[PDB]
């Protein structure tokens, strides 16, 4: 299992890649342990949006 | 609104499946659609206009041929169509006879003689 | 360094190594191209060149320090100036450090590995041995040529490879 | 300044006699082919000088602003004139010219610039054989 | 900023915690102690070395104060010794237990106004503003403290009374059942210090069992679940099987006799009589709680019952802070930061003119 | 969209001021 | 564009080898042209061997 | 699980390249923004969505690899509709295109107008950015060297 | 308004003048079905690419049937 999740998260980095995200290899972890929650992804998407301007805001 | 979902419309229409129950045929749809979208050949209306003629006289019809001209008539007065040429070409070619060779008859033209 | 890099070019006795240093200082005289470029369509202004005075300093010192240096001895000719701690030097060196690591970093993994070992010019530590195919080739056969162990490489890095 | 530019010009006029004269039957059959993957590469040298002229009109375009430009030019055409002038001076056909791009893939391991455009020349030439 | 201060007290069951909100600690822990000679008045290390010839009093252990008077002491000696502040010009965010009637919190409210005097205040529930900093607003908490226990729904922003479980179980059931299962072993419990030294063993070295069946098969074939301990006292209290069926009694709860719910039963007669349109919403934010928070192994049969509650088409979202201890503290500090919590923070001029009961509409 | 719109009460009137849309 | 030099580039090979074949095949007919067209096939250089590869599929009809 | 996951990504948005309090402070602004939203096959098509626009938007080639990635995804299912709706927050050659000088069959036909016109545009784009370039170097420099007297670095308002 | 029922009144002419063609010339294509090909050649769109697209939806509910 512990082989299996380091593989998807090797696959899972190209979907992304190819989509053109925001979204770094740390913060794609973060979000990919948070949708597979339950939680659903189309309001994780703004508040991911809203956070990352809320810092922008401070600097 | 975007031009994909309206092809998912039709999807619903025209199979018992909703848009939502396949995704195969999606795929090849926009596989299709896309990079033929916007018109790349050249307009005539009057040839469409000859050619639902011409398949009107293959119905053996001469009466509803002349009745079709009033109708070319009253599609130009009400003007609120974007190509004519299109939508006439459209059902022509999805035209079922109720009951050989013709790439030798006249057609549009490719415009690869023409910078586009 | 206009001079340098002309002249490298109809080499290729120079070696790899020498070969690519050339190449990185090229790439980091287009930019001072660049400004040549677009000073000429604006035709005393000496603060505005106090700061290209300065790198152009650094290229011609590493030009001038480095001269007819090729191998692991031009890899201990830009690995002096990764000692440096004022980072305008390091940001200089860097573009061409990469690329003068590039040649021996590639043996690196077919000389660990299996794989093609180009030694027919010596800029590699291996200094390979004729005529030893018996079978007493588990001892010495790549002597370790100390001129061309690089500064990254240590004793321990040089052979243990080996 | 048009000193600085000439190896340039050199490494693209000796390479075009090349792909004209061992283009012709006779002359080898991965030969025939290392020619032909050789139009592919005049090609990108021959845009750069297309386009250069129509920006030349606005006057956009000078004799430093192209010497700044052809910076990798100057050494990846370079080697195609040398492989060119190889094949040319001493005749190679075959499995002889085979051989001759089997040393210059070694030869250039660790340039990392004059080693991916012969890198790509092999694979491509190679289909007949 | 230059916006006027905020500060935080929760007069906890075991503890006294003090502080300045948007702290992530607690700014001072002393003991919940209010001595008289058994100095007169002192909370802090020179009380809890005093135990032996002072009394050791918690106002709070019920979920309801008890004395009221040692309330309002420990919360004043606590603002002017523990933080050594000056009461007129702080406001404080007060935080109780759940269920606390309306009469109770309108004499909170009073005495807080009246004999400490805050120019600003709230007064309000403890498992919710433990949830605001735990996660999501909305969700179900499963809140067990020290001597409370509630499954509390919340799709409001704050608790729906309708469907909100007492439930007794609670760190005070189980040092109760530690007790028992020590005098049925035979083994002296001698004192209180002994009674808190073994509460913690068990929340921090003890196994907490991660089946019934199994530790049970290990322990019947023969015992090696025991781990040795070696105080410094020089206390030696080991062994295996008995250890890891001392905090099994939550997920059978007929193993000590307890009649009311266990942990899956009170989460799923929650959920039953709360609204479905909400039930995936709700079941997507469960807490964690209890003093387990040194050694867990009570989050994988919670997780594996509430896997086996709801169908396998949604997943299970169990929310694990890295708090469930301090929870309760965090819940404050991050809400008393706030400017917009200015709209549910009162302020003294309303209190003289809507009269005393607005705290509970304002405050909410 | 247009057709769903399209379906509204119309009169049956016609005009005899205006030919060019009688409704 | 330098005289649109890049659009006539792939012109006088597609050229070139159109005018081989009507240089090389001059009174001719039955299989004695079967085998002057069947030579420019042979060729290892691709052009030749991609456009005479469409040509014989028509001669030989 | 997720809660102290999200304690790394208020590590992350914080510079790493003091440090302690100001993270309890981003966290506070954290928490007090996420729950907003949170109060208040269907999932291959919005990929499918996206690539049509791609194809329109000229860039062949994405497409046609984007369907040829979204066959392999489904041979974690919310992590994708996650993606598709990031799709457009993110940061903001080749030899061939008309040689017929390698294949062993290729279909004879003219020319078009929209393939080697279109080819030397790709190179029309890179020529005019190393020039816009030069423009942009020169200035963001002489925008720092020249404005005014008592103008500079912040290091003279200590 | 008046002349905006005027023009929504101009649109059913049109729409009973296409659902005329489309009879006389007994095409696969009902009404509900032309009201989103009408919609598809407004926008300017090839009329090959979408009948091809026509031809296998229509086979592909007799791989439903």
């Given at each position: 299992?512990?082989?299996?999740?380091?593989?998807?998260?090797?696959?899972?980095?190209?979907?992304?890649?190819?989509?053109?995200?925001?979204?770094?290899?740390?913060?794609?972890?973060?979000?990919?342990?948070?949708?597979?929650?339950?939680?659903?992804?189309?309001?994780l998407?703004?508040?991911?949006?809203?956070?990352?301007?809320?810092?922008?805001?401070?600097? | 609104?975007?031009?994909?979902?309206?092809?998912?419309?039709?999807?619903?229409?025209?199979?018992?499946?909703?848009?939502?129950?396949?995704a195969?045929?999606?795929?090849?749809?926009?596989?299709?659609?896309?990079?033929?979208?916007?018109?790349?050949?050249?307009?005539?209306?009057?040839?469409?206009?000859?050619?639902?003629?011409?398949?009107?006289?293959?119905?053996?019809?001469?009466?509803?041929?002349?009745?079709?001209?009033?109708?070319?008539?009253?599609?130009?007065?009400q003007?609120?169509?974007?190509?004519?040429?299109?939508?006439?070409?459209?059902?022509?070619?999805?035209?079922?006879?109720?009951?050989?060779?013709?790439?030798?008859?006249?057609?549009?033209?490719?415009?690869?003689?023409?910078?586009? | 360094?206009?001079?340098?890099?002309?002249?490298?070019?109809?080499?290729?006795?120079?070696?790899?190594?020498?070969?690519?240093?050339?190449?990185a200082?090229?790439?980091?005289?287009?930019?001072?191209?660049?400004?040549?470029?677009?000073?000429?369509?604006?035709?005393?202004?000496?603060?505005?060149?106090?700061?290209?005075?300065?790198?152009?300093?650094?290229?011609?010192?590493?030009?001038?320090?480095?001269?007819?240096?090729?191998?692991?001895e031009?890899?201990?000719?830009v690995h002096?100036?990764?000692?440096?701690?004022?980072?305008?030097?390091?940001?200089?060196?860097?573009?061409?450090?990469?690329?003068?690591?590039?040649?021996?970093?590639?043996?690196?993994?077919?000389?660990?590995?299996?794989?093609?070992?180009?030694?027919?010019?010596?800029?590699?530590?291996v200094?390979?041995?004729?005529?030893?195919?018996?079978?007493?080739?588990?001892?010495?056969?790549?002597?370790?040529?100390?001129?061309?162990?690089?500064?990254?490489?240590?004793?321990?890095?040089?052979?243990?490879?080996? | 300044?048009?000193?600085?530019?000439?190896?340039?010009?050199?490494?693209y006029?000796?390479?075009?006699?090349?792909?004209?004269?061992?283009?012709?039957?006779?002359?080898?059959?991965?030969?025939?082919?290392?020619?032909?993957?050789?139009?592919?590469?005049?090609?990108?040298?021959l845009?750069?000088?297309?386009?250069?002229?129509?920006?030349?009109?606005?006057?956009?375009?000078?004799?430093?602003?192209?010497?700044?430009?052809?910076?990798?030019?100057?050494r990846?055409?370079?080697?195609?004139?040398?492989?060119?002038?190889?094949?040319?001076?001493?005749?190679?056909?075959?499995?002889?010219?085979?051989?001759?791009?089997?040393?210059?893939?070694?030869?250039?391991?660790?340039?990392?610039?004059?080693?991916?455009?012969?890198?790509?020349?092999?694979?491509?030439?190679?289909?007949?054989? | 900023?230059?916006?006027?201060?905020?500060?935080?007290?929760?007069?906890?069951?075991?503890?006294?915690?003090?502080?300045?909100?948007?702290?992530?600690?607690?700014?001072?822990?002393?003991?919940?102690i209010?001595?008289?000679?058994?100095?007169?008045?002192?909370?802090?290390?020179?009380?809890?070395?005093?135990?032996?010839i002072?009394?050791?009093?918690?106002?709070?252990?019920?979920?309801?104060?008890?004395?009221?008077?040692?309330?309002?002491?420990?919360?004043?000696?606590?603002f002017?010794?523990?933080?050594?502040?000056?009461?007129?010009?702080?406001?404080?965010?007060?935080?109780?237990?759940?269920?606390?009637?309306?009469?109770?919190?309108?004499?909170?409210?009073?005495?807080?106004?009246?004999?400490?005097?805050?120019?600003?205040?709230?007064?309000?529930?403890?498992?919710?503003?433990?949830?605001?900093?735990?996660?999501?607003?909305?969700?179900?908490?499963?809140?067990?403290?020290?001597?409370?226990?509630?499954?509390?729904?919340?799709?409001?922003?704050?608790?729906?009374?309708?469907?909100?479980?007492?439930?007794?179980?609670?760190?005070?059931?189980?040092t109760?059942?530690?007790?028992?299962?020590?005098?049925?072993?035979?083994?002296?419990?001698?004192?209180?210090?002994?009674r808190?030294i073994?509460?913690?063993?068990?929340?921090?070295?003890?196994?907490?069992?991660?089946?019934?069946?199994?530790?049970?098969?290990?322990a019947?074939?023969?015992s090696?679940?025991?781990?040795?301990?070696?105080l410094?006292?020089?206390?030696?209290?080991?062994?295996?099987?008995?250890?890891?069926?001392?905090?099994?009694?939550?997920?059978?709860?007929?193993?000590?006799?307890?009649?009311?719910?266990?942990?899956?039963?009170?989460?799923?007669?929650?959920?039953?009589?709360?609204?479905?349109?909400?039930?995936?919403?709700?079941?997507?934010?469960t807490?964690?709680?209890?003093?387990?928070?040194?050694?867990?192994?009570?989050?994988?049969?919670?997780?594996?019952?509430?896997?086996?509650?709801?169908?396998?088409?949604?997943?299970?979202?169990?929310?694990?802070?890295?708090?469930?201890?301090?929870?309760?503290?965090?819940?404050?500090?991050?809400?008393?930061?706030?400017?917009?919590?200015?709209?549910?923070?009162?302020?003294?001029?309303?209190?003289?003119?809507?009269?005393?009961?607005?705290?509970?509409?304002?405050?909410? | 969209?247009?057709?769903?719109?399209?379906?509204?009460?119309?009169?049956?009137?016609?005009?005899?001021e205006?030919?060019?849309?009688?409704? | 564009?330098?005289?649109?030099?890049?659009?006539?580039?792939?012109?006088?090979?597609?050229?070139?080898?159109?005018?081989?074949?009507?240089?090389?095949?001059?009174?001719?007919?039955?299989?004695?042209?079967?085998?002057?067209?069947?030579?420019?096939?042979?060729?290892?250089?691709?052009?030749?061997?991609?456009?005479?590869?469409?040509?014989?599929?028509?001669?030989?009809? | 699980?997720?809660?102290?996951?999200?304690?790394?990504?208020?590590?992350?948005?914080?510079?790493?390249?003091?440090?302690?309090?100001?993270?309890?402070?981003?966290?506070?602004?954290?928490?007090?923004?996420?729950?907003?939203?949170?109060?208040?096959?269907?999932?291959?098509?919005?990929?499918?969505?996206?690539?049509?626009?791609?194809?329109?938007?000229?860039?062949?080639?994405?497409?046609?690899?984007?369907?040829?990635?979204?066959?392999?995804?489904?041979?974690?299912?919310?992590?994708?509709?996650?993606?598709?709706?990031?799709?457009?927050?993110?940061?903001?050659?080749?030899?061939?295109?008309?040689?017929?000088?390698?294949?062993?069959?290729?279909?004879?036909?003219?020319?078009?107008?929209?393939?080697?016109?279109?080819?030397?545009?790709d190179?029309?784009?890179?020529?005019?950015?190393?020039?816009?370039?030069?423009?942009?170097?020169?200035?963001?420099?002489?925008?720092?060297?020249?404005?005014?007297?008592?103008?500079?670095?912040?290091?003279?308002?200590?």
């Amino acid at each position: 299992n512990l082989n299996a999740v380091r593989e998807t998260m090797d696959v899972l980095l190209e979907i992304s890649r190819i989509l053109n995200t925001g979204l770094d290899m740390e913060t794609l972890s973060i979000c990919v342990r948070l949708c597979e929650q339950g939680i659903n992804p189309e309001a994780l998407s703004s508040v991911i949006k809203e956070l990352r301007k809320a810092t922008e805001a401070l600097k | 609104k975007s031009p994909n979902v309206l092809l998912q419309n039709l999807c619903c229409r025209i199979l018992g499946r909703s848009e939502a129950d396949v995704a195969q045929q999606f795929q090849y749809a926009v596989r299709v659609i896309g990079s033929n979208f916007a018109p790349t050949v050249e307009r005539d209306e009057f040839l469409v206009a000859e050619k639902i003629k011409k398949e009107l006289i293959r119905q053996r019809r001469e009466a509803d041929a002349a009745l079709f001209s009033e109708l070319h008539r009253k599609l130009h007065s009400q003007g609120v169509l974007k190509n004519k040429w299109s939508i006439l070409y459209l059902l022509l070619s999805l035209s079922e006879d109720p009951r050989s060779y013709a790439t030798l008859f006249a057609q549009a033209l490719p415009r690869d003689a023409h910078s586009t | 360094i206009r001079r340098y890099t002309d002249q490298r070019s109809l080499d290729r006795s120079f070696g790899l190594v020498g070969q690519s240093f050339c190449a990185a200082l090229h790439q980091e005289l287009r930019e001072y191209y660049r400004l040549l470029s677009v000073l000429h369509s604006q035709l005393r202004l000496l603060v505005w060149t106090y700061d290209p005075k300065i790198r152009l300093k650094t290229l011609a010192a590493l030009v001038d320090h480095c001269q007819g240096r090729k191998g692991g001895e031009l890899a201990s000719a830009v690995h002096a100036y990764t000692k440096t701690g004022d980072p305008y030097m390091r940001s200089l060196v860097q573009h061409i450090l990469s690329l003068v690591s590039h040649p021996v970093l590639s043996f690196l993994y077919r000389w660990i590995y299996d794989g093609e070992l180009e030694d027919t010019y010596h800029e590699f530590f291996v200094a390979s041995d004729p005529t030893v195919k018996t079978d007493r080739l588990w001892h010495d056969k790549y002597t370790l040529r100390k001129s061309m162990i690089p500064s990254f490489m240590t004793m321990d890095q040089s052979r243990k490879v080996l | 300044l048009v000193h600085r530019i000439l190896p340039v010009a050199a490494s693209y006029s000796a390479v075009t006699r090349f792909i004209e004269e061992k283009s012709s039957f006779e002359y080898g059959q991965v030969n025939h082919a290392l020619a032909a993957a050789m139009r592919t590469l005049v090609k990108e040298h021959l845009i750069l000088v297309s386009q250069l002229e129509q920006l030349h009109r606005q006057g956009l375009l000078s004799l430093q602003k192209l010497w700044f430009y052809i910076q990798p030019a100057m050494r990846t055409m370079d080697i195609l004139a040398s492989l060119a002038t190889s094949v040319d001076k001493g005749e190679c056909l075959g499995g002889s010219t085979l051989s001759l791009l089997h040393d210059r893939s070694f030869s250039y391991t660790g340039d990392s610039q004059a080693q991916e455009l012969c890198l790509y020349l092999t694979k491509a030439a190679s289909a007949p054989y | 900023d230059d916006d006027i201060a905020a500060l935080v007290v929760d007069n906890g069951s075991g503890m006294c915690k003090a502080g300045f909100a948007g702290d992530d600690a607690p700014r001072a822990v002393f003991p919940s102690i209010v001595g008289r000679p058994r100095k007169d008045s002192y909370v802090g290390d020179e009380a809890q070395s005093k135990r032996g010839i002072l009394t050791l009093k918690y106002p709070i252990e019920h979920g309801i104060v008890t004395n009221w008077d040692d309330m309002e002491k420990i919360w004043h000696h606590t603002f002017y010794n523990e933080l050594r502040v000056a009461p007129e010009e702080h406001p404080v965010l007060l935080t109780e237990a759940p269920l606390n009637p309306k009469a109770n919190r309108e004499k909170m409210t009073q005495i807080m106004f009246e004999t400490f005097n805050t120019p600003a205040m709230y007064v309000a529930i403890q498992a919710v503003l433990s949830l605001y900093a735990s996660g999501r607003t909305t969700g179900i908490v499963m809140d067990s403290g020290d001597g409370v226990t509630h499954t509390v729904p919340i799709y409001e922003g704050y608790a729906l009374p309708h469907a909100i479980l007492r439930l007794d179980l609670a760190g005070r059931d189980l040092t109760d059942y530690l007790m028992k299962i020590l005098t049925e072993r035979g083994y002296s419990f001698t004192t209180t210090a002994e009674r808190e030294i073994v509460r913690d063993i068990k929340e921090k070295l003890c196994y907490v069992a991660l089946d019934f069946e199994q530790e049970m098969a290990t322990a019947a074939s023969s015992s090696s679940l025991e781990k040795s301990y070696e105080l410094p006292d020089g206390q030696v209290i080991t062994i295996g099987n008995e250890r890891f069926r001392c905090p099994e009694a939550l997920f059978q709860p007929s193993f000590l006799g307890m009649e009311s719910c266990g942990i899956h039963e009170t989460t799923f007669n929650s959920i039953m009589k709360c609204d479905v349109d909400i039930r995936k919403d709700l079941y997507a934010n469960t807490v964690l709680s209890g003093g387990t928070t040194m050694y867990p192994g009570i989050a994988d049969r919670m997780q594996k019952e509430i896997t086996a509650l709801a169908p396998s088409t949604m997943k299970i979202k169990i929310i694990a802070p890295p708090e469930r201890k301090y929870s309760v503290w965090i819940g404050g500090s991050i809400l008393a930061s706030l400017s917009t919590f200015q709209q549910m923070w009162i302020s003294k001029q309303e209190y003289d003119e809507s009269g005393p009961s607005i705290v509970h509409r304002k405050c909410f | 969209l247009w057709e769903a719109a399209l379906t509204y009460e119309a009169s049956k009137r016609r005009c005899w001021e205006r030919v060019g849309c009688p409704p | 564009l330098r005289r649109l030099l890049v659009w006539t580039y792939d012109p006088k090979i597609r050229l070139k080898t159109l005018a081989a074949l009507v240089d090389h095949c001059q009174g001719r007919k039955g299989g004695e042209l079967a085998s002057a067209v069947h030579a420019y096939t042979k060729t290892g250089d691709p052009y030749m061997r991609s456009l005479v590869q469409h040509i014989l599929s028509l001669v030989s009809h | 699980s997720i809660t102290q996951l999200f304690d790394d990504l208020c590590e992350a948005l914080l510079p790493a390249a003091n440090r302690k309090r100001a993270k309890r402070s981003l966290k506070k602004v954290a928490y007090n923004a996420l729950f907003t939203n949170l109060f208040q096959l269907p999932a291959r098509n919005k990929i499918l969505m996206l690539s049509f626009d791609l194809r329109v938007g000229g860039l062949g080639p994405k497409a046609d690899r984007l369907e040829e990635l979204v066959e392999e995804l489904e041979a974690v299912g919310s992590v994708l509709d996650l993606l598709v709706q990031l799709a457009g927050s993110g940061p903001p050659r080749d030899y061939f295109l008309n040689n017929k000088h390698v294949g062993r069959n290729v279909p004879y036909s003219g020319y078009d107008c929209d393939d080697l016109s279109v080819f030397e545009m790709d190179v029309q784009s890179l020529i005019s950015r190393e020039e816009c370039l030069c423009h942009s170097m020169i200035q963001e420099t002489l925008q720092v060297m020249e404005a005014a007297p008592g103008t500079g670095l912040p290091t003279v308002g200590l």
